[PDB]
Amino acid sequence: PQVQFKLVLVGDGGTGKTTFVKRHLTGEFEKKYVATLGVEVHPLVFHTNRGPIKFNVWDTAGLEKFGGLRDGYYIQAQCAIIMFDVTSRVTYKNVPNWHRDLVRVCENIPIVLCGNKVDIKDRKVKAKSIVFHRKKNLQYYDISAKSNYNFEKPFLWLARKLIGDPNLEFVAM
Amino acid sequence: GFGSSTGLSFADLASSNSGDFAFGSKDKNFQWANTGAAVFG
Amino acid sequence: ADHAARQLLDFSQKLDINLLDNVVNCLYHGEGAQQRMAQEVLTHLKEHPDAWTRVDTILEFSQNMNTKYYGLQILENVIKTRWKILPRNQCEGIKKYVVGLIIKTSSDPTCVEKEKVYIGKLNMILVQILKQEWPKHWPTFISDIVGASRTSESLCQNNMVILKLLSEEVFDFSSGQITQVKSKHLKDSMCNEFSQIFQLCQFVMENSQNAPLVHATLETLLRFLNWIPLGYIFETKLISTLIYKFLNVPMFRNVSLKCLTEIAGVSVSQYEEQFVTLFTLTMMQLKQMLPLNTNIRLAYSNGKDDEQNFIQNLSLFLCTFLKEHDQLIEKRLNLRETLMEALHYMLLVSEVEETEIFKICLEYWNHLAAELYRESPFSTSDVPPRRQLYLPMLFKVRLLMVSRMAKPEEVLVVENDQGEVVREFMKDTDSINLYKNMRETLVYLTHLDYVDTERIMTEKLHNQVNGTEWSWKNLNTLCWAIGSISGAMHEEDEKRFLVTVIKDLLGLCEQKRGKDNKAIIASNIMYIVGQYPRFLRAHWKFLKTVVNKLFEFMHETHDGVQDMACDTFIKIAQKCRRHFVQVQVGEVMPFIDEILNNINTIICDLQPQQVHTFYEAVGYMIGAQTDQTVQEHLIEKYMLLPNQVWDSIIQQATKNVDILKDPETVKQLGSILKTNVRACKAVGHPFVIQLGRIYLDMLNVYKCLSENISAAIQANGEMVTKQPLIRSMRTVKRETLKLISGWVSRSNDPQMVAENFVPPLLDAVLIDYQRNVPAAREPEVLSTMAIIVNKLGGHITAEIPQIFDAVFECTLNMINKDFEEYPEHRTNFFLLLQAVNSHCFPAFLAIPPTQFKLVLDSIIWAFKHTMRNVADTGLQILFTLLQNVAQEEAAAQSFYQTYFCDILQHIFSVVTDTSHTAGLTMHASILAYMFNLVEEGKISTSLNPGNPVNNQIFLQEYVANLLKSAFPHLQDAQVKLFVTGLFSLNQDIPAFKEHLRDFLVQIKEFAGEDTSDLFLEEREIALRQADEEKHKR
Amino acid sequence: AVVSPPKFVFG
Ligand SMILES: Nc1nc2c(ncn2[C@@H]2O[C@H](COP(=O)(O)OP(=O)(O)OP(=O)(O)O)[C@@H](O)[C@H]2O)c(=O)[nH]1
Ligand SMILES: [Mg+2]
C-alpha cells in the first residue's frame, strides 16, 4: 500500500496491546503475557472500499522498566490508540498520563480510547465511570481481543478521520 | 560547566522593559475575523 | 554496520554527530532489523551515566530535529534523577543554557512555527528544573517570566505555554511523581504568586490582537480554572469577557465554551447570582450563533470537525450547568423562557447521530426524570410544583426515548480455542448500559404519565401499519420501546395496551408480503410477548397458543427464526415455569407432560446448540415441580433420548474401547455432555438422579480420552493439539469437568456429595492429571476442584492431603521456572490454593512442614508475577493466611518466628518495584496488618534468636538495614522517617498507601546530602499527629 | 445406590 499512516498504541502494561495487534496480524489469540521491550513496529493492511489503507502500528511498552525512548516514539505520529483494561481500575486511572505524554508531542491527531477485556464477567471499570474522553474529544470503544468484540471499530474510525471519508467501510479481500 | 552560553535570560529581559507592554492597544474599530458568524455556515 | 552503530557508546573520543543522526533516522525511518538495532543502540546510549555531558554538542551541531529531541531526553532524565548531586556550577550552567535556548528559539516566529516539538521539550525541561529548584533557589522566576512576557508576543505565547505546563505538573499530574510535602509546598508557592500571572492573562485577553497569543492565553486559563481560588473567577470580569469577546468569535468558540463549562461545574453557595448571569448571558450569546430553528442533526452530519467539537462541548456545558443549578434557574420566575430554550437546545442536540453526544444528553435526561419521579411517583392529575415546569416538554423527551431506543441484547458469534462457534450474550458492555439508561428514563416518564407514552407508541404503530413510515429498523425500535416499559403500568392498562399492540401487529403480519417481512414481524411479536410475562401468566390459552406457535417456528429454515423461537421459549420458560407443571383449567394433564411426550418431533430440525437451549428451557420447567416422586419421573422421562444414545455408546465401547477414537462417537459424547450440562444448570440438585446414573461411565470415558490425548501428544509433540480429533477429545473432557463442577455448585447436601461423588474424582481425574505429560494436562481440573472446595468446605478437609499429593507438586514444578508459560495453570492453581486456604485451612496443619514451606513459597511466587490476576490472588491468599494464623495462638508464634521476616522482606521486594504498583493497595494492607500485629505485642516470642529484644525495635533496625542495603543512595534520615511512618500509620490504610507512594518517589532520585526537599520537620509532625489520633481511638 | 456401578470399566 502507498497510503501509510503511523499509529501509536499506548497504555499500561498487561492491558492487551500486543495481543490486540497480533489478532489483526495473524488472527491468533495469545494467552501468555510477555512484556514488550521498548517498541515493536507492525504493518497492518486493511482493504476499504476506496483501496488499501496501511497502519504502521508502533506497539509500545507499558512497563516503566521497559519504556525505552518513551515520548520519542510519538514523533511524527498521525493516529493514536490509548488502551486500558476494564478489569483493572489502575489502568483507567493512568489514561490521563498517557494522554498527556501523547498530546505534548502530537498536538492534533485522532485518538481512540479502547477498554479491553470486556468479555470477563468481573468488570471493575463500569461503563458509567468512563467519562475521560468527553472533555478531550476522543473516541471510545469497548473491545475484546479474545472475542473479537468491536474488533475493527478503532481502526475504522481512525481511517475515516485520516482519509476524510465518513462513508468508508472495510471490505475483506 | 555545560555549554557556556552568551544567551539572554528572563531577568535581563524583564529589567530592560518597564511595566509598559509591547503588545497592541485594541486599535479603533477592530474585531476578530468572522465575529458573530453562525456555527453552521 | 552494527559495530559502527555501537561505536556511540565508546565515550573515549568526541561524539560523532553524523553517526548519531544516521542511527536516529534508521530508528524513525527503518524497515526491519535496522530499526531494532538503532532502537537498542539509542536506548543503551540514553541510560549511560555521564552521557548528558555530550548534549551540549548535540544541540549545537546536529541539524536533524529528532536527534536534538534525543539529547533533550537525556538531559531531562539527568535533571529528574541526579539534579541534587550535581555541583552548583553545573546546575547553574544547565539552567542558563536552557533558558537562553528557550528565549532564542521562542523569539523567532519561523522556528517556533516549524518545530513546535523541540520548543515543547525545552519548555518541559524548564518545568522540570523549576520543580527541582524553583522556590528555594529561584525566588524571582514568576516576576521575571511575567516581566519578560511584556517584551514580545511570541515570548508571551511561549511563557503562557510554560505556565500552563507548570500548572499541570504541580496541580494535575503531581500524585505519584512528587512527595506529598513537596507537592504541597509547590502548590502553596504557586498559589501565593498567582495574582501576578493573572494580570498578564487579563491584559493579553483585553489588549492583544494576535490570534495565536490570545488562543494560548485561553488554553492556559482553561488549565488554571481547575485550582485557582474562586475569587479570581466570580469577583472579576472573567465570565463577561469570555462570553462576549471570545464566545462569538469562531476561532475561540471551543476553548471559551470549555472555560465556561469548567466554571459552571463549580458547586458553591456564596456565588449564585454569578451563575444566574452565567446562564442568561451564555444563552443569549448562543441563540445568535445556533438558532433554535436549526436542524442540528443534518448540520452536524455534514460539518467540519470544529463544528462537531462545538456541538459536543455545548452538550457538555448544558448538561453540567443544568445538573448543577437547575434549582437556581427554576427559582427565578422571569428565567422560565431561558430554561425552556436551554431544554430545547438539549432536545435538538439529542437528535445528532453520535453515540457520545447522545450519552451526554441521555445522562441529563435520566437525571431530570429521576428527580421528577422522586418528587412524586404518581401520575399527573394537582401537580407537584417542580413537575409543572417541565410538563410542556416531557412528551418530547418521551418521543425521543421511544424513537431512538437501543437494542436490548448483544449477541456475538465467537469460536473458542477448540474451533467451536457459539453465540455469546455480552452482558455489561457500553451498549447494554445505553439501553438500560434509556429504559430507566422511559420507565420513569411512563410512571409520570402512562397515557401519553401509550399514545406515542400507538401513533407510531399506526404509522407502521399504514406504510407511511414502514421500515425494519423502525419496527424493531418501536418494539424494543414497547418491551422496555413492561411492568410500568397497572395490570388492566397493560392488558388493554398489549391486546391493542398485538392485534395490530398480527394484522400487519398478513398485510406485508414476502417471507422476510413476515419473519421480522413474527420475531417482533414474540419479543413483545416474552417481555410481558404477567400477561401470559394471567391468561393460559394465550400462553399455550404462544408456546405452540414457538414450537412451529422451530421447523422454520429461514435464517434467524429458530434462534428467535429458542430465545423466546427460554424466556417464557424461565418467567412462567410454574404454569407448565401444574394442571390448568380445561387441561387433563400438565403441559410439561405434553412437551415431553412429543419432544423428538419438536427438536428434529434444530441445530445442536438450539437443541441444548431447548433442553435448558424444558429443564427450567422441571425444577418448578415441588413434588419429589413426580419430579423424579419427569427427570427420568426428560433425559430419555440422551440416555439412549449414551447407553448405546457405552455398551458399544464395552466390547472394545477402540471406538472412542472414532471422531463421530466423540462428537456424540460431546453433544450429550453439553445437553447434560444445560439440563443440570436448569434443574439443580434434583439432577442427582441423572448425575449418579452416568457418573462412573463418564469418569471412565474421561480417563480413556485423557490417556489417548497424552499418548498422542507425547508421541507426536504439541502440534497435534490442533487436530480435529484431539480437539473433540479435549471438548469431551472439559464438558465432563463442567458437568461435575456445575452440579456440585448447585447441590444442597455437602455430606452426601463428599461421601459419594468426590472419592471417584481422586482416582479418575486427579491421578490421571498427575500421570499426564505437562503439555496434555487440563487446567480446568485445577478449577473444578476449587469449585468443589468452595462448596463442601469443611466436609472435604480430610481429603486435601490427597488432592495436594496429586496436583500440587506437578503443577508447581510446571509453573516455577518463569512467569510466562502456562497462564491457565497458574491462574487455576492459585485459585485452588486460595480456596483451600479460605475454606480448608486446618488441612495445612496435617501436611508435613516441608509441604507447608512449599505452599508458602508458592504463595510468595504468586505476588511476584507481572500478571495482575495471579499477583492479586497471591496477595489475597497471603492476607487470608496471615489472618487465619493469627487466630490460632498455639502455632502462631512458631509461624511468626519461621516466616515473619521472610514475608516482610518479600513484600518490601515487590513494593519497591515499579512493575507492581497496581497492587499497592494490598501491599498497604498486608504490611499494615503485620506492623500493627507487632505494635500490639501479638508476637510474644522474640523474632531475634540472638537475644531477647523488643520486637518494635528489632523490626525497625531490620527494615532500616533492609532498605538501606537495597537502595544505598538513600540518606539515613529519610529511611528512618519511612520506618517511623510504617510503625505509625499502621491503622490508616490510605495514609499508609500515600507513605508507600512517597517512598517509591524518593527511591528514584539521588538526593546526595540535600535536605531541602525532605521537609523532615513537617513530616515528623504529621506522623506524630497520626500517632496521637491512633492512640485516642 | 446413589451412584450406579460402571458398565464400562477402563483398566
Ligand atoms: N480475558 C482476556 N484476556 C486478554 C484479552 N486481551 C488480552 N488478554 C490477556 O492480557 C495479557 C496481556 O496482554 P499483552 O498484549 O501481551 O500485554 P501488553 O498489552 O503488550 O502490555 P505490555 O507488553 O507490558 O506493554 C495477555 O497475555 C492476554 O492473555 C481479552 O480480551 N480478554
Ligand atoms: Mg506488548
The fraction of residues assigned to DSSP E strands of chain C is: under 5%
Topology, number of strands of chain C:
2
Which pair has the most extensive contact?
Answer: A-C, 50 and 50 residues
Radius of gyration of chain C: 36 Å
Which radius of gyration of chain A do the C-alpha atoms yield? 15 Å
Order of SSEs of chain A = EHEEEHHEHEH
Principal-axis shape of chain A? globular
The CA-CA distance between the termini of chain C, in Å, is: 69 Å
Description:
It is classed as transport protein. The entry lists the keywords karyopherin, sumo E2, transporter, GTPase, GTPase activating protein, exportin, G-protein, transport protein. The entry is titled "Human RANBP2/RAN(GTP)/RANGAP1-SUMO1/UBC9/CRM1/RAN(GTP) - composite map and model". The structure is cut from a larger assembly and holds 1 copy of chain A (173 residues), 2 copies of chain B and 1 copy of chain C (1033 residues). Chain A has 173 residues and is an alpha/beta fold. Chain A has helices at residues 17-26, 89-93, 95-103, 132-136, 153-163, and strands at residues 4-11, 39-48, 51-60, 79-85, 111-116, 139-142. In chain A, strands 2-3-1-4-5-6 form a 6-stranded mixed sheet, with helices on both faces. Helix content of chain B is 17%, strand content 0%. Chain B contains 1 helix and no strands. Chain B starts with 9 loop residues before the first helix and ends in a 25-residue tail after the last helix. With 1033 residues, chain C is mostly helical. Chain C has a two-stranded antiparallel ribbon with strand order 1-2. In chain C, strand 1 and strand 2 form a beta hairpin. The longest helix of chain C has 29 residues, at 688-716. Chain C is globular, with a radius of gyration of 36 Å. Chain C starts with a helix and ends with a helix. Chains in contact: A-C, B-C, C-D. The interface between A and C is large, with 50 and 50 residues. Guanosine-5'-triphosphate binds at residues 13-19, 30-33, 35-36, 61-63, 116-117, 119-120, 144-146 of chain A.
Record the SSE blueprint.
The structure is cut from a larger assembly and holds one copy of chain A (173 residues), two copies of chain B and one copy of chain C (1033 residues).
Chain A: E1 4-11, H1 17-26, E2 39-48, E3 51-60, E4 79-85, H2 89-93, H3 95-103, E5 111-116, H4 132-136, E6 139-142, H5 153-163
Parallel strand pairs in A: 1-3, 1-4, 4-5, 5-6
Antiparallel strand pairs in A: 2-3
Chain B: H1 10-16
Chain C: H1 2-6, H2 17-28, H3 33-46, H4 55-61, H5 65-82, H6 88-106, H7 109-114, H8 118-137, H9 141-148, H10 153-172, H11 180-192, H12 199-207, H13 211-224, H14 231-234, H15 238-246, H16 253-264, H17 273-286, H18 296-301, H19 305-331, H20 336-349, H21 355-375, H22 385-403, E1 411-415, E2 421-425, H23 430-448, H24 450-465, H25 472-484, H26 491-511, H27 515-530, H28 533-538, H29 540-553, H30 561-575, H31 578-581, H32 591-597, H33 608-622, H34 628-638, H35 640-655, H36 663-683, H37 688-716, H38 724-745, H39 750-756, H40 758-771, H41 780-792, H42 800-815, H43 823-839, H44 849-862, H45 868-887, H46 889-911, H47 920-935, H48 951-966, H49 972-984, H50 989-1002, H51 1016-1032
Antiparallel strand pairs in C: 1-2
Helix pairs in contact in C: 2-3, 4-5, 5-8, 6-8, 8-10, 10-13, 13-16, 15-16, 15-17, 16-19, 19-20, 19-21, 20-22, 21-23, 22-23, 22-24, 23-24, 24-25, 24-26, 25-27, 26-27, 27-30, 29-30, 30-33, 33-36, 35-36, 36-38, 37-38, 37-40, 38-41, 40-42, 41-43, 42-43, 43-45, 44-45, 45-47, 46-47, 47-50, 48-49, 49-51
